[PDB]
């Protein structure tokens, strides 16, 4: 139970950013 | 373009276009599309017109008086110049003659 809740808070912050609109781009290459 | 609904589609120096409102001043009638118009910068609305294609091109094109050259001061090619007068001048001065023949006036040279 304890571990799952920590995932739930992290997920909500990800949710705020993903919210539309967002810049569209293209990846020229991955150096990696 | 003007859309009758108190809105207009304008282009500014900046690249995107704007669906703007007309706000007071110049009436839709008194505007002509293709005119250069006054926008308020904070909110872009047509606050008037005074510019009227303020541009050097307008300057060069307009000539309300008649030209400096008066007629057949120029010497010779008389006949030639009395061909350009048949087509151009003659229908503006009198379309009557053309109507009576049953033929459209010549246009252009």
């Amino acid at each position: 139970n304890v571990m799952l809740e920590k995932i739930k808070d992290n997920k909500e912050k990800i949710k705020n950013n993903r919210q539309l609109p967002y810049l569209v781009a293209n990846v020229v290459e991955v150096m990696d | 373009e003007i859309i009758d609904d108190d809105h207009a589609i304008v282009t500014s120096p900046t690249m995107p276009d704007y669906y703007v409102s007309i706000l007071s001043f110049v009436d839709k009638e008194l505007l002509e599309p293709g005119c250069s118009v006054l926008l308020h910068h904070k909110t872009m609305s047509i606050v008037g017109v005074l510019q009227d294609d303020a541009d050097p091109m307008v300057s060069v094109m307009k000539m309300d008086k008649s030209p400096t050259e008066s007629y057949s001061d120029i010497g010779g090619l008389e006949s030639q110049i009395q061909e350009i007068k048949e087509s151009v001048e003659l229908p503006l001065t009198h379309p009557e003659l053309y109507e009576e023949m049953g033929i459209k006036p010549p246009k252009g040279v």
């Binding site: 912050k13 705020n16 950013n17 993903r18 919210q19 | 910068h41 904070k42 909110t43």
Partner: protein, 289 residues
């Protein structure tokens, strides 16, 4: 008649000043957010004891981004320590433009006016500030009502007022028709000052350490050569230089980029330095044995 309606002299602690700077700089470019914690007494005294930056929100400054889950939570932890302070406003950065409340932000600041009646919106602009002093200003809602009913004169009593001429048009219109600006003062105790002031004892321990001594010769040598090359142009300059009219002389004998000035400057630098160098060398030697 009416209340004084004198905007608070906003006493923004040194701790709050440093702390807005950290959050705001690192968080570029995303416009950051948070609440200001302090206490309002009298008619014109707010001390901002401390501030805390709410978790980043991808939406930017919004009514969305102000959020009570974070509000509650931080304050509940401060209960345990007894360092608890009520919300007295909010700060945010616009770093992409100077210090002035947006049309969106005026709606938001009005929500906070319900919470606390002396709520501030303090815009800190971090990239454009080069020192963390310039382009930082404080604001407080002036109603739409005030503007209509000619109540703005009531609002500026007992104040000197602050105008930010720069940034106009629109922006300025909104600013004038939304908030009122007042000076921002920094208060600190002298125990704090002493900390700020402090360094170390290894500061002076280093100041007794000596460089390799060949390198010191290099500098003395170099200066002499340095000054030879500029002494020719100075020599040339004063050959005549008696001709009438000063303005002409400045072009002719190169009085711009003045060789006299430039010679005294180099001599004097090298000189103060070589007095420290001989002094330090002797002090160490006699001290030790």
């Amino acid at each position: 008649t009416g209340r004084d309606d004198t905007k608070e002299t906003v006493y923004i602690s040194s701790i709050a000043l440093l702390k807005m700077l950290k959050h705001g700089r690192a968080g570029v470019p995303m416009e950051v957010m948070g609440l200001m914690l302090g206490e309002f007494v009298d008619d014109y005294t707010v001390n901002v004891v401390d501030v805390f930056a709410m978790p980043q929100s991808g939406t930017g400054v919004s009514v969305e981004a102000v959020d009570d889950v974070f509000q509650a939570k931080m304050m509940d932890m401060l209960k345990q320590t007894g360092r608890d302070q009520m919300v007295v406003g909010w700060y945010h950065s616009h770093p992409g433009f100077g210090c002035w409340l947006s049309s969106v932000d005026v709606n938001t600041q009005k929500s906070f006016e319900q919470l606390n009646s002396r709520a501030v919106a303090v815009v800190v602009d971090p990239i454009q500030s080069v020192k963390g002093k310039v382009v930082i200003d404080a604001f407080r809602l002036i109603d739409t009502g005030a503007l209509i009913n000619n109540l703005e004169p009531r609002q500026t009593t007992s104040n000197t007022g602050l105008l930010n001429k720069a940034n106009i048009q629109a922006l300025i219109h909104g600013l004038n028709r939304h908030y009122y600006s007042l000076n921002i003062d920094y208060h600190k105790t002298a125990k704090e000052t002493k900390m700020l002031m402090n360094l170390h004892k290894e500061q002076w321990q280093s100041g007794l350490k000596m460089y390799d001594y060949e390198e010191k010769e290099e500098s003395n040598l170099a200066a002499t050569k340095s000054m030879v090359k500029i002494a020719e142009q100075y020599s040339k300059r004063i050959e005549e230089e008696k001709e009438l009219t000063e303005e002409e002389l400045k072009t002719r004998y190169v009085g711009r980029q003045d060789p006299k000035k430039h010679l005294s400057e180099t001599a004097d630098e090298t000189l103060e330095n070589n007095i420290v160098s001989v002094l330090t060398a002797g002090v160490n030697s006699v001290a030790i044995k």
